[PDB]
Design an enzyme around this catalytic site. Structure first.
Site, short mmCIF file in Angstrom:
data_model
loop_
_atom_site.label_atom_id
_atom_site.label_comp_id
_atom_site.label_asym_id
_atom_site.label_seq_id
_atom_site.Cartn_x
_atom_site.Cartn_y
_atom_site.Cartn_z
N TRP A 15 0.78 -1.20 0.00
CA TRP A 15 0.00 0.00 0.00
C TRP A 15 0.85 1.32 0.00
O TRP A 15 0.68 2.17 -0.90
CB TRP A 15 -0.99 -0.04 1.14
CG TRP A 15 -1.91 1.11 1.12
CD1 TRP A 15 -2.44 1.73 0.02
CD2 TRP A 15 -2.45 1.78 2.26
NE1 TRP A 15 -3.29 2.74 0.41
CE2 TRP A 15 -3.30 2.79 1.78
CE3 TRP A 15 -2.29 1.62 3.64
CZ2 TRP A 15 -3.99 3.65 2.64
CZ3 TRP A 15 -2.98 2.47 4.48
CH2 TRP A 15 -3.82 3.47 3.97
N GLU A 43 14.87 -6.98 -0.55
CA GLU A 43 14.87 -8.43 -0.71
C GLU A 43 14.66 -8.89 -2.19
O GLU A 43 15.31 -9.82 -2.70
CB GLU A 43 13.86 -9.06 0.27
CG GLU A 43 14.28 -8.91 1.73
CD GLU A 43 13.71 -7.64 2.45
OE1 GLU A 43 13.65 -6.53 1.88
OE2 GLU A 43 13.30 -7.77 3.64
N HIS A 65 11.85 -5.30 4.89
CA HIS A 65 11.37 -5.81 6.17
C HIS A 65 12.54 -6.24 7.02
O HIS A 65 12.37 -6.63 8.19
CB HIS A 65 10.43 -7.02 6.03
CG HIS A 65 9.31 -6.84 5.04
ND1 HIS A 65 8.55 -5.68 4.95
CD2 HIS A 65 8.81 -7.68 4.12
CE1 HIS A 65 7.65 -5.82 3.99
NE2 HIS A 65 7.79 -7.02 3.47
N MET A 98 -2.74 -15.38 8.80
CA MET A 98 -3.86 -16.31 8.69
C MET A 98 -4.57 -16.22 7.34
O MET A 98 -4.65 -17.23 6.63
CB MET A 98 -4.84 -16.13 9.87
CG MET A 98 -4.74 -17.21 10.94
SD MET A 98 -4.85 -16.62 12.66
CE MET A 98 -3.11 -16.26 12.98
N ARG A 99 -5.09 -15.04 6.99
CA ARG A 99 -5.73 -14.86 5.68
C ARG A 99 -4.71 -15.24 4.60
O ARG A 99 -4.98 -16.13 3.76
CB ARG A 99 -6.25 -13.43 5.48
CG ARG A 99 -6.98 -12.86 6.69
CD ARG A 99 -7.23 -11.36 6.53
NE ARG A 99 -7.58 -10.70 7.79
CZ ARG A 99 -6.77 -9.89 8.49
NH1 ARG A 99 -5.55 -9.60 8.06
NH2 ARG A 99 -7.20 -9.35 9.63
N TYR A 161 0.03 2.35 10.35
CA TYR A 161 -0.94 1.84 9.40
C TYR A 161 -2.30 2.43 9.73
O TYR A 161 -2.90 3.09 8.88
CB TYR A 161 -1.04 0.33 9.48
CG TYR A 161 -2.02 -0.24 8.49
CD1 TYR A 161 -1.71 -0.30 7.13
CD2 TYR A 161 -3.27 -0.72 8.91
CE1 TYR A 161 -2.60 -0.82 6.22
CE2 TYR A 161 -4.18 -1.25 7.99
CZ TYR A 161 -3.83 -1.29 6.66
OH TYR A 161 -4.71 -1.81 5.74
N1 LIG Z 1 -4.59 0.05 -0.99
C1 LIG Z 1 -4.64 -0.38 0.30
N2 LIG Z 1 -5.18 0.36 1.30
C2 LIG Z 1 -5.22 -0.08 2.58
N3 LIG Z 1 -4.74 -1.27 2.98
C3 LIG Z 1 -4.16 -2.11 2.09
C4 LIG Z 1 -4.08 -1.69 0.67
N4 LIG Z 1 -3.46 -2.68 0.01
C5 LIG Z 1 -3.17 -3.66 0.92
N5 LIG Z 1 -3.59 -3.32 2.16
C6 LIG Z 1 -3.42 -4.14 3.38
O1 LIG Z 1 -2.06 -4.07 3.79
C7 LIG Z 1 -1.58 -5.33 4.25
C8 LIG Z 1 -0.45 -5.75 3.37
O2 LIG Z 1 0.70 -5.82 4.17
P1 LIG Z 1 2.15 -5.72 3.49
O3 LIG Z 1 1.91 -4.99 2.19
O4 LIG Z 1 2.88 -4.94 4.57
O5 LIG Z 1 2.63 -7.15 3.38
C9 LIG Z 1 -2.72 -6.30 4.11
O6 LIG Z 1 -3.40 -6.38 5.36
P2 LIG Z 1 -4.72 -7.31 5.57
O7 LIG Z 1 -4.46 -8.50 4.64
O8 LIG Z 1 -4.77 -7.72 7.04
O9 LIG Z 1 -5.87 -6.36 5.22
C10 LIG Z 1 -3.55 -5.61 3.04
O10 LIG Z 1 -4.92 -6.03 3.07
#
Ligand SMILES: Nc1ncnc2c1ncn2[C@@H]1O[C@H](COP(=O)(O)O)[C@@H](OP(=O)(O)O)[C@H]1O
Ligand SMILES: Nc1ncnc2c1ncn2[C@@H]1O[C@H](COP(=O)(O)O)[C@@H](OP(=O)(O)O)[C@H]1O
Lengths: 248, 248
Positions: A15, A43, A65, A98-99, A161
């Site tokens: 995001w 990475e 990360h 989990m998801r 976040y």
């Molecule tokens: N455009 C957006 N706006 C807000 N949240 C977003 C997004 N795109 C992805 N996310 C959420 O950001 C997280 C992705 O984590 P990362 O990018 O750090 O690996 C996921 O959490 P969830 O799967 O719990 O919602 C995802 O759903």
């Protein structure tokens, strides 16, 4: 000088990398790999043996990360100028795994396990997927309070976040401002270009083109709730940082 | 000075890393990760953000499938002293992917596809699993004839998988000798410690302990045979190197 978008896994890294990319282009993000192009995930580059120059003469945005003190980052010891440190509720990251792994909310056995492991690990350390990320607190500490132990010339901006969600344009502009990236007009648009909606769209388009890609705790609870709260209020560094960032 | 065990994917890298490790210890390889300990695979270290020191004062063995000119290796530009370059029949590596990915000899459709891709790619470039390895010739060229374009102080020893098979102790000793690792008595034992048998054993023990791990062309043939021979005798660099290393 050199800049890191640092974030534990699941904190919303994609995001924010999305928005920052679209703010620099001022053009939307046409394609999922467009994100890796705009704000490369360290990475990712190392996997194909890329590895950006130590001390660029012009500002450079990277993301990772890794904890801030992994040997590999040592090449960037003197050149690192700035660090945006993206943080989210450790409860949510756990739910996120989990998801991620598949697993509907039901398979308690499945989820109970992951949660107990998360808890004894204080974060993702046992999860094969990521590496050198540390536990949540280890990671955060490393990019913040102890940032100077790895990057002595470094200023840091923490961004939650949760705060980015409540108000994407204000918060993003704070990151833009911090990073000295420019105006504030771009911010409005950039925010819009990367929306749960847009991101899902932008995502599955590329999947289909054959391109590279990727509640609360009541359920399962009673005792997995107890184990968490107990950790979330201990004398450990996890509890320290949960307190400090309003997950308390 | 610093030393690379360089090898395209599937050329027998694990096997040789096994022997070299056991020759340095003089003790057998008790555990599969013991191989990563003895002769670390570069990609493995970078994944968890390790990254060994440029110019160690004492000799250091590393291994990689990267081509010799990937940016990341630039840190080792002046310190690289020596390069063992492990090569095997490109026909066999292709067959190797197949066993690798699952796929019994039968599923022609499956295998025909991979082979045609292999052929247009002159090696593994389209295969998600590895990165920055190049095509077979690209890779070999990079570690051999053009090695000095990346590592100007570097001497190279090529060793054929096929030769290591025919005679493990003679060939290994050549690598030992080249690397200035010591005697020749160790060689006999070391060879024995890493045998198809031993390696399979050493492997599944660790899998079970919950540890991190990993013919000819007639079948499918007639035309996938024709496409290969046509490439294997072209004016391309693949054919050049197949000719030079007795795969002709
Ligand atoms: N455009 C957006 N706006 C807000 N949240 C977003 C997004 N795109 C992805 N996310 C959420 O950001 C997280 C992705 O984590 P990362 O990018 O750090 O690996 C996921 O959490 P969830 O799967 O719990 O919602 C995802 O759903
Ligand atoms: N101890 C040993 N002796 C000989 N060959 C071995 C071995 N251990 C593994 N191999 C073979 O070496 C190849 C492994 O490639 P790498 O380690 O470079 O990825 C595999 O080829 P095959 O699967 O075609 O036999 C494997 O079977």
């Amino acid at each position: 000088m050199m800049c890191w978008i640092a974030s534990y896994p699941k904190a919303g890294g994609h995001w924010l990398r999305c928005m920052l990319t679209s703010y620099v282009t001022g053009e939307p993000v046409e394609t999922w790999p467009g994100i890796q192009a705009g704000v490369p995930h360290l990475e990712g580059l190392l996997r194909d043996g890329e590895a950006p120059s130590a001390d660029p003469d012009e500002q450079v945005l990277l993301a990772t990360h890794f904890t801030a003190d992994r040997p590999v980052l040592r090449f960037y010891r003197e050149s690192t100028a700035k660090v945006v440190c993206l943080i989210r509720n450790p409860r949510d990251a756990m739910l996120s795994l989990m998801r991620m792994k598949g697993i509907p909310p039901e398979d308690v056995e499945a989820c109970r396990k992951i949660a107990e492991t998360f808890i004894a690990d204080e974060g993702f350390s046992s999860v094969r997927i990521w590496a050198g990320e540390g536990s949540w607190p280890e990671n955060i500490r490393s990019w913040t309070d102890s940032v100077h132990e790895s990057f002595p010339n470094a200023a840091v901006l923490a961004v939650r976040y949760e705060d980015l969600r409540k108000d994407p344009e204000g918060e993003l502009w704070k990151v833009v401002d911090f990073l000295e990236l420019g105006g504030r007009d771009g911010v409005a648009d950039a925010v819009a270009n990367c929306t749960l909606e847009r991101m899902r769209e932008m995502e599955e388009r590329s999947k289909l083109l054959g391109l590279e890609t990727t509640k609360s705790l009541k359920f399962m609870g009673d005792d997995i709730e107890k184990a968490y709260a107990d950790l979330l209020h201990g004398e450990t560094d996890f509890a320290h940082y949960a307190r400090l960032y309003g997950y308390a």
